[PDB]
Amino acid sequence: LTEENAKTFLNNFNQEAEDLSYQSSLASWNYNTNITEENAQKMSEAAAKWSAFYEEQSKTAQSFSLQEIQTPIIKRQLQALQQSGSSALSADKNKQLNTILNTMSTIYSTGKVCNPKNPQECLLLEPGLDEIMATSTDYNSRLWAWEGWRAEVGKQLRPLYEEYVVLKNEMARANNYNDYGDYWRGDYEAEGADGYNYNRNQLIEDVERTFAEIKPLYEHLHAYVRRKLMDTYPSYISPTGCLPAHLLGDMWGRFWTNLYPLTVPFAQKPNIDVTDAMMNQGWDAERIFQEAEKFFVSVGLPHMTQGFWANSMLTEPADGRKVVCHPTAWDLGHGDFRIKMCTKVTMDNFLTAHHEMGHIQYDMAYARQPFLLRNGANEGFHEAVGEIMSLSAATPKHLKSIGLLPSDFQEDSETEINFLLKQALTIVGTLPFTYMLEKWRWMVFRGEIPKEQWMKKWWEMKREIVGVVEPLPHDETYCDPASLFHVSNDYSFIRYYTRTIYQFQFQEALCQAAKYNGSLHKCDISNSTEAGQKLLKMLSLGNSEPWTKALENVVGARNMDVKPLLNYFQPLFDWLKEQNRNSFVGWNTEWSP
Template sequence: MDSWSHILRLLVIVVAVVIPSSEQISVDGGRDRRATQLDDALEFLTDYNSTAEMVYSASSFASWAYSTNITDYNQMKEVEASLKAAAFSKSSAMRAREFDDVIETFPEDVQRLLGSISDIGVSALDNDTVQEYNEIMGEMNKIYSSTPVCRADDPSECLNLEPGLGNIMATSTDWDELVWAWKGFRDAVGIPNKPLFARYVEIANQGAVANGYEDLGDSWRSGYGDDLEDQAYELYNAILPLYKQLHAYVRRKLNGVHGSEHVPLTGHMPANVLGDMWGRFWTNIYPHVVPYPDLPNIDVSDEMVRQNYTVCKMARMADEFYSSMGLFPANDEFWENSMLERPDGRDVVCHASAWDFYNRVDFRIKMCTEVNMDYFLTLHHELGHIQYYMNYKHQPVSFRGGANGAFHEAIGEVMSQSVATPKHLKEVGLFDGEDDPTDVTDTDINFLLKMALPTIGTLPFSLALEQWRWDVFSGKTDVNAGTARWWQLKNDLIGVKAPVDRTEDDFEAGAMYHIIISYPFIGYYIRTIIQFQFYQSLCQSASHTGPLHKCDFYRSTEAGEKLAAMLSMGSSRPWPEAMEALTGQREMKADAILEYFQPLMEWLEKTNTENGDVIGWESPTVTTQESTTAGGPSALGNASLWMMCLFAVISSIIHGY
């Protein structure tokens, strides 16, 4: 018997003891009926959990097979498995909803489980529509992952996104080459995905409405509270002064690389010169913008090559980082089954991802890893997901997830943040530069600038992308006429522009992986904020002293113990409780991220003033978001005092397994 089934059966016994007998409640005949209904609910949840593990495991295996070997056959098998999972979800949701009239009398954990099972997205629709949806998602993924871009002057030379086009965007300083790759990928991938995406929006919204939401954006926001949009823009305005200083500094440096013809010293930057296909992470432009280039390189990619690092060594080091904190090491199944390098002879989805196969044993990573620092940090990030999976594997299936959509991503990032410090890189023999534990040195400025590129640099990107999708889901923006709104948000929020003219015949969203797989991007935005709250707390547990950015909690079992306690909760408790368990705070705040980058902010202000740079761009600053979030289904009622106490005890048992 698994731990969850055992606990549910224990609960049934306790309920029978605590609830008065029928003779004692004869004056209120409804109470014994409610006790019976709770028994029924607990029995349903036990059966659901064991079946869900098998069904969702089978679906995950089919998805893995397709993602690691893109063939028509594997796509067909993935759709078949998805349909079976959808049918199970739908029948389970219907059964869970049979308790709607009495659910407010149930303990809080039971309410959360039934509510989670009831909310099934597109699976709530008829089978034909669900099948159409799965086929659309598979086709968009296939177009994205396997469509090459061929050169007009040499059609025999064709490049896929990874590694070919990705390497161009990361390393080239040839303006025409960057434009070719940027536009070519959007022509080859984005435009063909446009009609598929339009139909996806229709079906996804139907699924959201069937689950009680206004649209899919409303559904995604519901996990964060009713005022998420207001919170998102408050956080944006908190980091905007720092972002504008970083933007001005980067703009001047890239002006020196590409010339004023392409990157002017004022206004917007072109989106194709920021280091990747989307201008999402600015990490790869670090060699062009490093403040003190004569110092030992904070980017240790060359040193890794010099020391003959392999992908396997990088992965083992990432795993050892977690085990050094007393956390779980990756198991044999992980090492046997993960795809850590791009295989020869077949098309695969190279986008890095971590997988939970719902059997409490099989956890994997899928990556096309190369030997450099960026992938080194990505391995630590993906193993953060694996660590989360392993810590909450004892939870019922419905609670095997992050406390909200941002927590999973934040865990991986906070680990990468510690690994990237000069202190840690010195510890593992990859950096031999200075590392003063208390003073802010030129090396620190190099490090902080490098850390700001993928964090501060990406925050406006994440918000603009998600705002566009919210507008599409709500009907404010038409998919077939969405290019103007896309670039308006890019101009206003990020201060970037398209490198070539764009029209409504184009479709930028179809060339963004997270959009075509229907992944809520707001989680990335929130994670970038809360990872610094997590980092600050773990540093305190590790007894760090000195500036926050110098902290490395490698080998701190105290930090590991605190982290594991939160990870083991999964999504079993409301996210503010998980936040409080790790940080002592219940809200998302920008305080920690601003403290971390304060030395860089002071340096940027001084440097930009000396250079005479104009801070910001022509577009008006966004200060608030007028639209309101309708929110999801109303909050469920509280359990009685004795049930709250009982479940507090049981929760502690679950988290101890």
């Protein structure tokens, strides 16, 4: 029978897949913690063998017909296995697309903009230009850096994007999708029992509905940031106009977190930084991860494995081997969970340790599931379940409980206001950018935007949605989105938006579970076993069930809700309303100086 054949095929497949995936993950780990040519080539052969085996099994798995499979776990496993991805095209088209991706990657990593009239002062983005975007206050230098990187990236990446869109559209239509946007929206598709059905076309309208009510809070934040920047820049910013694109603290305006010194509410009040307290008490990375483990066992989740402590790196090795600075949590398979992080004794690395151990706990919980179902419910759940730990770890209650912060510490409203404003600049400010970018990519892949009117559409929407105007007029020979890392290297961007919604939804659900009686931003989930069990019910599922069922399991709702996000920022929203009475909230679409 077809169902029994699929069961035996999956039983045969899982053990081989787990072995080859472990070999690939171990080779990738060995490259990531020890960078050399031999580790790179070993990783290359391991990934080649694993990918070849996966495609070979996927071609056999596509022979099965899903119309006669009743059990939803086997059907979901076969759905996961049958995603061919880029292999649906012919060898010529796949090779051309891979060539375009590789040239985009190697031209983004070697991006170069150089000083006019000073030819020796040529700057790359990664060491020097990000410092200019984060710290510099000079208008002309930021205008130079933004326009120069836009020119020397957009002019070289416009035709590459022109055939990139066509090849991705061909690949998606070869995989029974309407466009590449629908292929990305198929990651959120859930087929299951009645009432849990979610569709790809639903997602867009859901995002628009959730952006219908974030807009007043974003408008108040934009007005406050515009007023503070007007204080910084006297005549170059208009009261009723949009913000300039190069004054947002980042290269692309993705995060507003670098505007915090310019937009501080109370400069006299310090931040909640506890780095000096860690220095005085002689803390190290081992103590940081031990405190994180103490937090995760206080909430009720299981302890860390012995292999986690034995195999991970928590410090710069300094023995001659190059490592990657980015913290990453690795689920190698067969119960092997590791963290690669060069942990310095700082508050930021402490929160990052909580985030990555949240990733590891998420990986550990679904280990009982089959190999094809050892993933997140969607792309947003995995990062949200680490972001909630990062949220809870940073609270003054958590820092006072573990001795980092003194017992007699006074929490006045001013530190809560400026902390909430910094969180809004990091978190709320990226949401219109994410929504506008994803909407632009979806409409480009769909063909709703005409081919010769790409740029003119994008700068309209940034004037309309993000409320950010271009500093200089750009014609259609530019490719202004393509300067971002995620879009030049073929990465989905809606995961950050869904992460942001799910993070506050999970946080409010856990705080209601833990019976916290105060403001949401002060909430800690420590010493609450019931919240840990409520969380672990979702964490144990993996993607065995539809993501709507997991969302109902945590928050009691089957869709995205931004009421937790507004509830988190409610004191800040009241404060922004209190200081925007005289000013004009909102922006005008036409270019105002």
